[PDB]
Amino acid sequence: ACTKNAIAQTGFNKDKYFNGDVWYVTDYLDLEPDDVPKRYCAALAAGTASGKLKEALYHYDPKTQDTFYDVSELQVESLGKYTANFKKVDKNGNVKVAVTAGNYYTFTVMYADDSSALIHTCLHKGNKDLGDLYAVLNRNKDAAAGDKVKSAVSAATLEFSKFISTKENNCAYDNDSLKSLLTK
Numbered sequence: 751a752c753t754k755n756a757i758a759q760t761g762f763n764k765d766k767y768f769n770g771d772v773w774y775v776t777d778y779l780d781l782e783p784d785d786v787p788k789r790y791c792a793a794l795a796a797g798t799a800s801g802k803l804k805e806a807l808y809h810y811d812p813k814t815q816d817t818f819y820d821v822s823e824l825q826v827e828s829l830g831k832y833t834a835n836f837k838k839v840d841k842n843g844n845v846k847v848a849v850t851a852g853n854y855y856t857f858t859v860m861y862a863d864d865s866s867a868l869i870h871t872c873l874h875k876g877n878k879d880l881g882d883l884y885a886v887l888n889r890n891k892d893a894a895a896g897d898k899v900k901s902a903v904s905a906a907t908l909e910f911s912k913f914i915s916t917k918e919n920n921c922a923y924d925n926d927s928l929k930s931l932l933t934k
């Protein structure tokens with residue numbers, strides 16, 4: 751279960767974050783791991799599409815090859831804090847699993863600038879017991895975490911040394927499908 755009320759970034763710039771571009775997860779911290787995808791690739795696009803606030807998600811497990819995309823319309827709770835009901839889609843946006851109540855994630859932007867970000871998410875998916883997940887994002891899939899975002903990890907009272915890197919998984923992403931999915 752989740753246990754954190756993540757604090758959104760003071761003066762969070764929503765139009766800059768939600769500009770329709772892609773963010774890559776470079777490092778993550780799951781507060782309830784198992785034994786676990788210690789190996790994992792993830793990326794998202796975030797933008798406004800025809801006046802609606804949207805995110806498109808991509809997950810890939812580089813060992814099992816388990817692959818899935820999601821699209822969500824985000825609802826605002828407060829600045830930098832959202833509730834997202836998701837639908838699993840193929841890369842082209844055709845629905846595989848429809849939106850349903852009980853399938854949602856919260857999303858908090860704790861820190862962001864033009865190249866990097868720190869987010870918290872709490873996933874809810876039917877029957878599952880899932881925990882808090884923090885992710886360090888960058889606009890460049892290969893970028894080592896900078897002092898700006900590492901300071902934010904500290905300020906959130908976390909230790910960046912506990913985060914797991916995704917960079918040794920040689921992830922490759924379809925940026926084009928992530929951007930396109932924002933409209934779907």
Ligand code: HEM
Nearest residue numbers: 775778787790791792794809820836837838855871873885
């Ligand atoms: C690198 C970090 C990531 C890891 C390692 C990870 C891992 C996973 C795994 C293992 C599941 C499958 C859960 C279940 O079915 O048992 C999953 C699903 C999901 N994750 Fe992540 N995730 C990460 C990042 C993200 C981010 C950044 C978000 C939100 C922005 C997110 C949103 C979701 C959603 C919505 C699902 C359910 C999708 C569906 O069933 O259609 N994940 N994640």
